Amino acid sequence: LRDNIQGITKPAIRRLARRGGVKRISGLIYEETRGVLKVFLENVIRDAVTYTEHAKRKTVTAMDVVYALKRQGRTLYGFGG
Amino acid sequence: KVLRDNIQGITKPAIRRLARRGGVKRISGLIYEETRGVLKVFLENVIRDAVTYTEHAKRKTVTAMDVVYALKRQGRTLYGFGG
Amino acid sequence: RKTRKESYAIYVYKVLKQVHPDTGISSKAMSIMNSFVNDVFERIAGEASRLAHYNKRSTITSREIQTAVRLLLPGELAKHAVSEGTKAVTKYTSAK
Amino acid sequence: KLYPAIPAARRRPIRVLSLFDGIATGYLVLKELGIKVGKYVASEVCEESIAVGTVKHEGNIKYVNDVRNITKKNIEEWGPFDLVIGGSPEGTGRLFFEFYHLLNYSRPKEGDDRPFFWMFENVVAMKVGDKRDISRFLECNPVMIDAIKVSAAHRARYFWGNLPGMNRIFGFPVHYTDVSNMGRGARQKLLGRSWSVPVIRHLFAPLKDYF
Amino acid sequence: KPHRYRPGTVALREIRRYQKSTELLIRKLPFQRLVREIAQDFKTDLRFQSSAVMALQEASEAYLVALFEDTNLCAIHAKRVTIMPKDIQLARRIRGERA
Amino acid sequence: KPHRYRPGTVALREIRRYQKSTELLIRKLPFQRLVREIAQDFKTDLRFQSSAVMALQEASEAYLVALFEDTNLCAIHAKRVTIMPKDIQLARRIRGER
DNA sequence: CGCGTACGTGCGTTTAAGCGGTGCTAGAGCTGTCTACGACCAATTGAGCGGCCTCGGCACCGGGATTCTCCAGGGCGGCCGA
DNA sequence: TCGGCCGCCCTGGAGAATCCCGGTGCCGAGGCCGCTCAATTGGTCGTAGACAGCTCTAGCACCGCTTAAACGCACGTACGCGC
Ligand SMILES: [Cl-]
Ligand SMILES: [Cl-]
C-alpha cells in the first residue's frame, strides 16, 4: 500500500510530457512529478472527502470532485455540474 | 484637455525602486518599456472594471470601494479601503 | 423510481440545429455544454447578486445582469452579448 | 502621388472588373455607393459564384465561365475599365498572377487621362517572400491593417492598391460597431461581412467625388 | 541493415501523436489505487463512483499537461530542451502553488 | 579621485533599503495622470476619490513588485542576474495573463 | 574562457512632485412620495423528461500511395605527414 | 613533390510511419410517445425603487515656493553572450 505512487509509471509521465510538448526528459523529472501529482491529489481528495463528510455519505460522487476542483479554481466540465 | 503620454510618468527610477522591493539586483534597458506596458494593461483591466462598477452605481466618481470590488473580483483582494 | 434531473440538453441541441442543421453532438460534449451553461449561469447570477448587495438593492433586473455580462465576458464578446440581450429584452417588452 | 479630381457635374458610370470573389461584394457595394455602374464583369472557375449571381444579382452583370478565357480582345471589346479589384472568399499565388495579368490589360496607356483604380487583398499569413515579391510586382507597399480596433481576433490583413487615403485613416467606430453587433451570428458576420461591406466602402469612399 | 532514427524525430513524432490524441495516458487501475491510497489517510473505508475517479484522472492529467507546458517554457527559456526539476519548481513557484 | 563603490554593493544596499520601507515608490501625481488617461478611453469627465487612486497605487505597486519577484526568479533560473523582457514574458505566461 | 557592451555609479543640471494655501461647484449622499413591479396563491395545461428503437455516423481492420527520415555512395577538395 | 584519409555537399533509394480509401459492424444519438408537474395567466397587495429637492463634501482647479528626485553624460568593469 506504498508503491501506489509508483503506479504513475515512467512511460505514463513521458506520455503526459509528450502531450505537454516536452522533447527531452531528465531522469530526476519522474520522482518530482509523482510528488507534485501526489500533492495535487492530496488537496483535491482532501476537499472531496470533506464534501462527502458534509453529505453524511460513504461514497465520493463525481459531483464532489467537480465541486472540489471548482473550489480550487480548476473547473472541470463533463461530469454533471 | 485630452490627457496623453502619461505612461512616461512612470519614470525609470520608480521602476528601479519597484525592482529593488522585488529583490532585483540588475535591470536591463528594455525592462522599463516592458514594465510600462504591463502596468498599462493591468490598469486597463482594473480601471475598466472600476469604471463599470461606477456605471452601474449611477455615479460619475470612482470610489475606493469600486476599485476594491474590482481588485477583489480579479482575485487580488486589497485590504485597507473596505470590502 | 421517479426523479428527473433537469438539464439544458434539448435547448443546446435546438440552438445547435439552429446554427448547424446537419451537425450532431455526442452525450459527453452535451454534458460539457450543460456544465458550461450551468457554470456561466452561476457566474453571472453570482456577480449580479454581489452587485445588488454592493448597491444596497434587493431586486435583480436586466441592468444588473447587463453589467455582470459586461464584467464577465472579455470585451467584444461582452459587447455582442449586451446587444443580443438588449435586443431580446426589447422584443420581450413589446410582444403579444 | 496625388491624382486630380474631376468635378461631380460629370456623372459617368463606373466600369468595374472584379476578378475573384466568393459572395459578390463589389457590385452590391457599388449599388450602395449611390452611383451607377457602367460595366461589371465577373468570372469564377467554380459554379458557386455563378449560382449566387444568377439567383441574387438580377442579371445586370457580364459573366465569363472561366478566368482563363478573358483575353485582350475581350477587354478592348467590353469597354475600358475604371476599377479593377482582386480578393478571395496553394492557389493564392495563382490568383494574384491572374489578377496582375488581367490588370496589365486594363491599365491605360501613357497619354490617357482616365482615372484608374485597382486593389488586391490577402491576409498577413502570407510568406514574407511572396509579400516582397508582390510588392515588387505591383510597385506599391501593402498596409498591415489589423482586426484589433473593431475586433479581437488575430486576423490582420495586407492591402495593395491605388486608393487615396489608405495609410492610417482607418480607426474604430462605435456607432457602426453598435449597429453591427445585433446578431446571434455577430462574429460570423465579423469574420465575413465585416471584411466584405465596411472596410471596402471605407477604402472606396472617395470615388463618389470623382463620379 | 537495422534502421534507427535520430532522437529528435521520434520525440517530435510522439509529441505530435499525443497532442493529437485525447485518451487518458495514466492507466485507470494504478491511478485508482493511488486515489484510494491518498484517500485512506483521510477516512477509512471510502468508496468511489467510477465517474469520480475518471473526473480525478481527467483533471490530474490536464493539470500535469499544463504543468509540463510551463516546464517546457522554463526549459526553453533557460536555453535548454531538456526539462529539469529546476523547471518544475520555477513553474510551480510562479503559479503560486509552493506551499 | 573620490570613493566609488562596486555595482553589487549599492545594488544590494538598495534592495535592503526598499524591502524594509513601506512607502509608495511611484509618485502620486504622474500615477494619477496615468489613471485619468486610461479612464478617459472609457468615459469622459470621470472623477476620482483620493483613496481610490491611493488604492490603485497600492495594488499596482504590489502587483509590479510580485511581477519583479517572479521576473528575478526567471532571471536567476536562466543563470543570470539581469532581468529581461524574456523573463517578464515568461513570468506573465506561467501566471496565465498572456 | 574571451569579447564587448551596456548598465550602474557619481556628479551636475533641472524638471516637476509635493505641500500649502483658497474658491468653487458637481455630485455623493440623505429624505419624502408614491407607483409600478415583483412575491404570493390557484388552475391549467403543454413543454420537458423517462423510456425505447433503429440506424447511420463513428470506430476499426486492411491495402496502397505517399511522405518524411536517414544513411550510403560519388564526387569533392584538402590536408597534410610519414 | 605524393596520394591516403577525412569532413562537406548533393542525391538516391530503402524504410518506417502516416494519409487516404473503402468495407463491415456496433452502439449510442435522433426521434416518437406517455405524463406529470411546473410554466403560464389572472388577480392581489406591499414595499423597493424611480424621482424631485436639499444639502454639504470633497474633488478639481490654480498658484506659489520648495527642495526631492528625475534626466543626462562620462566611464569602467562585470556580467551577457558566443564559442
Ligand atoms: Cl428588468
Ligand atoms: Cl534539478
**Portion in strands of chain A:** under 5%
Task: Note the total helix count of chain C.
Answer: 4
Please compute the radius of gyration of chain A using only Cα atoms: 15 Å
- Could you give a short account of the major beta sheet of chain A? none
In total, the number of domains of chain A comes to 1
CATH architecture of chain C: Orthogonal Bundle
Helix/strand-derived class of chain A?
mainly alpha
Find the structural class of chain C using helix and strand composition. Answer: mainly alpha
Overall number of domains of chain C: 1
Label the overall shape of chain C.
Answer: globular
CATH homologous superfamily identity of chain A? Histone, subunit A
Which compounds are bound in this model?
chloride ion
Distance between the termini of chain C: 40 Å
CATH architecture of chain A: Orthogonal Bundle
- Quaternary organisation of the protein chains: part of a larger assembly
Major β-sheet profile of chain C: none
The helix tally of chain A amounts to 3
Biggest interface, CB < 8 A: B-F, 53 and 58 residues
Q: How many strands appear in the DSSP assignment of chain C? A: 0
CATH topology of chain A: Histone, subunit A
PDB class: transferase/dna
Keywords: methyltransferase, complex, transferase, TRANSFERASE-DNA complex
Entry title: The cryo-EM structure of the human DNMT3A2-DNMT3B3 complex bound to nucleosome.
Chains A, B: Histone H4
What is the element layout, followed by pairings?
This is part of a larger assembly, with two copies of chain A, one copy of chain C (96 residues), one copy of chain D (211 residues) and two copies of chain E.
Chain A: H1 10-19, E1 24-25, H2 29-54, E2 59-60, H3 62-71
Helix pairs in contact in A: 2-3
Chain D: E1 14-18, H1 26-31, E2 37-43, H2 48-55, E3 62-64, H3 72-77, E4 83-86, H4 92-106, E5 117-123, H5 128-138, E6 143-145, E7 157-161, H6 175-181, H7 186-191, H8 193-196, H9 198-203, H10 207-210
Parallel strand pairs in D: 1-2, 1-4, 2-3, 4-5
Antiparallel strand pairs in D: 5-7, 6-7
Chain E: H1 7-20, H2 28-40, E1 47-48, H3 50-77, E2 82-83, H4 85-95
Helix pairs in contact in E: 2-3, 3-4
Bound molecules: chloride ion (2 copies).
Residues 84-86 of chain E line the site of one chloride ion.
Chain F binds a DNA duplex (82 and 83 nucleotides) through helix 1, helix 2 and strand 1.
Modified residues (N6-lactoyllysine) (chain F): 20, 43
Family (chain F): Belongs to the histone H3 family.
Modified residues (Phosphothreonine) (chain F): 44, 71
